[PDB]
């Protein structure tokens, strides 16, 4: 079977990847993304993250690097081998390796 | 006997055995995480342990220069290798936590000639060279390395 | 050839006499008639199993593993009837064949033979089961003297260099064959595939010979080069660049 | 505990030599596995760092390019976000079996249908065409990066599992066998001495009986 | 005697002993790596080694088809099992480096009836079947083998 | 005899022997995988067997509290250690069917004082403490366990 990528992020980043063709609705009408409006609570972000990592259709989750640091508890607690998670930069937000949970494991890294 | 005739040699022997033991201990770290991961002191310890293993302790007895090796030649060789070790280690440790810092590559760049001489000293020949000539070359390498390290720190 | 046969059911003391008889003949041919001699003894284990009986006949108490303690001397007194001698051309060479009991090198029969003799050669059950004949395993084998049998004037100048490099490539080939079985062929480098293709061709052309094909040292070295030619010139690391320049070309 | 406790016999010496060759072969086979895994693991780690370095600049260019669309197309973002049905790009899970272990990875796939084709037809469509292409390029690096992540994490666990087996062989199985083989060789030699002593004392009694039997002729 | 009466048997004897030895090496490593490291040749080797071990070297002491097996039956069984090895190995090696490669799994599908027949060969009965009948059935298996491999080539 | 004077003992002896056996079975795996991979029931088994080993099997006969140990003290310690085991196992098995799963570490961090009380039971001394006093302390520990486990449910 196939899988899809999913997004948790700001309106601009979500808009970008939607024109990049990322956007789809599950059969239950739920999207494969959350637009994190400034008014959104941490519980909506974390619930969406926990839904996306447990969902059958989603293979990869993309999280804006600043949102990844908000949801850091669940993001570091996620330790399944298959469903991947990516912390990504954005225009008013941090760089691509900020606190990165994978890079911090390696002995061979500089 | 060494106190009467070779009074510096007991220190040198002790330091040599320690440098070699440290090579075997450091080789585990090199096998785990590579030579690049070691401290500067430990990198220069592998370089001197290499000189000791490659040009002090090895001796090809078929060559005219190594048919035999007098004790004075043996002391002079080890004295220079460990004098280089102490001066390199002082230069590294004196620049610890500094902006500009000494390392094996700087030493090899600015005084790779002294590393070349420390190997080359094995070729000196008690049959063709007088004891004074041999001792003088060893004393000159001590002065050369001291000036060379003094130009860095 | 002079052939002595002692049957399995011949008197046990004639089995003790047979080596002493053969070597006495070989000493006559070598040291008095100036011959070069190769003395082949076919099973020293059956001799040890005879010496045990003569010892039990004198009511001697058995030594280690039930054999007589003095077997080292008796075995030496057999085997040391060998060598070249001052002012003579004659020389007894010897190959004592020896069936290791229970396949075990620790057994006193091979153990004492390894103390008296200069080296050993192994027949191997693995090569035998693979139908490689002769099933001689090169890796645990060692001709202790080989450095004075070979080289310029004695055979050809390349021989030691060839033998060292063939040994190294067979050792690395066995290691890479084990690696293939762990990692799969896709994980092998081009160089690994060379040591593995060498390994296959080496067992099929170098070790394999069949019972009646006779090869000189010279023909063996030329087969050696036909195998070593598989590698790049630079990969043959134990060989000197002069020997490669004279013999790597085919 | 410290030994296997097979009872001392030449059988047991053979079986313990065979168990030692077995365990030593197992160590060597697993050492090759650990080395091959270690090499791939360190290669993948460098590819992760490099792939993140590549991703950052493409993402910054894409994120700035959206402002150009926001300049000419207005708040097109609301129409984009509100109107969703089916993706133009999706993924498939795939495997490698190198060094005897399954490594999960992903591949990028394209579904043709542009669910935003008419967006900004009236104005801004030049900028929106650049914009879709920039993020559509970014996604393929993300799919690759995610594959490196899952591979790296799986290799780390496989190396730990392999090194536990290698060291359990080297520090538990081989030491039980070598200490057992020493006990077997020792007690085998004890039986050989106890036999030797009995045979020697028998031989002395026989010599006494022979000497007495000759004395009885007088 | 074989070169007078059964010229095919010596090749079969050698190939049999080789396959049965390759099984010992492969059956060791798979305890630590599973199937994943095996080449297609090694999968074919294990399958034929299992056929030889389970259906040729295995024999029931107490049932008429197995109580005694004559040499005409014996060579015919081994000839088929090793002809499968050579043909299956050839099919892989012939399609290695091509755009599509014959795998052991493709072979296991397309040869399934031949594999059932190969394992069943042991049940042919020298009492109730004449040796010419058993040989004719075994020749039909060789023809079926050829036509089944021709589905792949 | 036990069925007349100590009717509770035969179950306790049986469970204690089994728990110690299960820890020695688990140990053969732990020595090649580490302490982490075990199921929570098996962690409880291992830790309880360590309590049985260190605070029941061991007895320091050169100290007044362990110089002698009557049967009523001995069975009372078993009743407490096995009551802890059954309740700790039950608490996991009752809740591992859900996200609200109790674990060995949850039990430990909620019950550290009860684990200390359990290990301390050896120090009770028949020279100073009456039989009823030792029994009453052990009965209080049984009640403390029950109320602590009821506080995890």
UniProtKB/TrEMBL annotation, chains B, E, F:
Catalytic subunit of the V1 complex of vacuolar(H+)-ATPase (V-ATPase), a multisubunit enzyme composed of a peripheral complex (V1) that hydrolyzes ATP and a membrane integral complex (V0) that translocates protons. V-ATPase is responsible for acidifying and maintaining the pH of intracellular compartments and in some cell types, is targeted to the plasma membrane, where it is responsible for acidifying the extracellular environment. It comes from Rattus norvegicus (Rat). It comes from the Eukaryota. The chain holds residues 494 to 646 of 647 of the full protein. It is found in: Cytoplasmic vesicle, Clathrin-coated vesicle membrane. V-ATPase is a heteromultimeric enzyme made up of two complexes: the ATP-hydrolytic V1 complex and the proton translocation V0 complex. The V1 complex consists of three catalytic AB heterodimers that form a heterohexamer, three peripheral stalks each consisting of EG heterodimers, one central rotor including subunits D and F, and the regulatory subunits C and H. The proton translocation complex V0 consists of the proton transport subunit a, a ring of proteolipid subunits c9c'', rotary subunit d, subunits e and f, and the accessory subunits ATP6AP1/Ac45 and ATP6AP2/PRR. This is V-type proton ATPase catalytic subunit A. Belongs to the ATPase alpha/beta chains family. ADP binds at residues 59, 61. Residues 1-99 form the ATP synthase A/B type C-terminal domain.
TrEMBL record, chain D:
Keywords: Ion transport, Membrane, Transmembrane, Transmembrane helix, Transport. Its main location: membrane. GO terms for molecular function: proton-transporting ATPase activity, rotational mechanism. Pfam families: ATP-synt_D (PF01813). GO terms for biological process: cilium assembly; protein localization to cilium; synaptic vesicle lumen acidification. PANTHER family: V-TYPE ATP SYNTHASE SUBUNIT D. V-ATPase is a heteromultimeric enzyme made up of two complexes: the ATP-hydrolytic V1 complex and the proton translocation V0 complex. The V1 complex consists of three catalytic AB heterodimers that form a heterohexamer, three peripheral stalks each consisting of EG heterodimers, one central rotor including subunits D and F, and the regulatory subunits C and H. The proton translocation complex V0 consists of the proton transport subunit a, a ring of proteolipid subunits c9c'', rotary subunit d, subunits e and f, and the accessory subunits ATP6AP1/Ac45 and ATP6AP2/PRR. Interacts with SNX10. This is V-type proton ATPase subunit D. The gene is Atp6v1d.
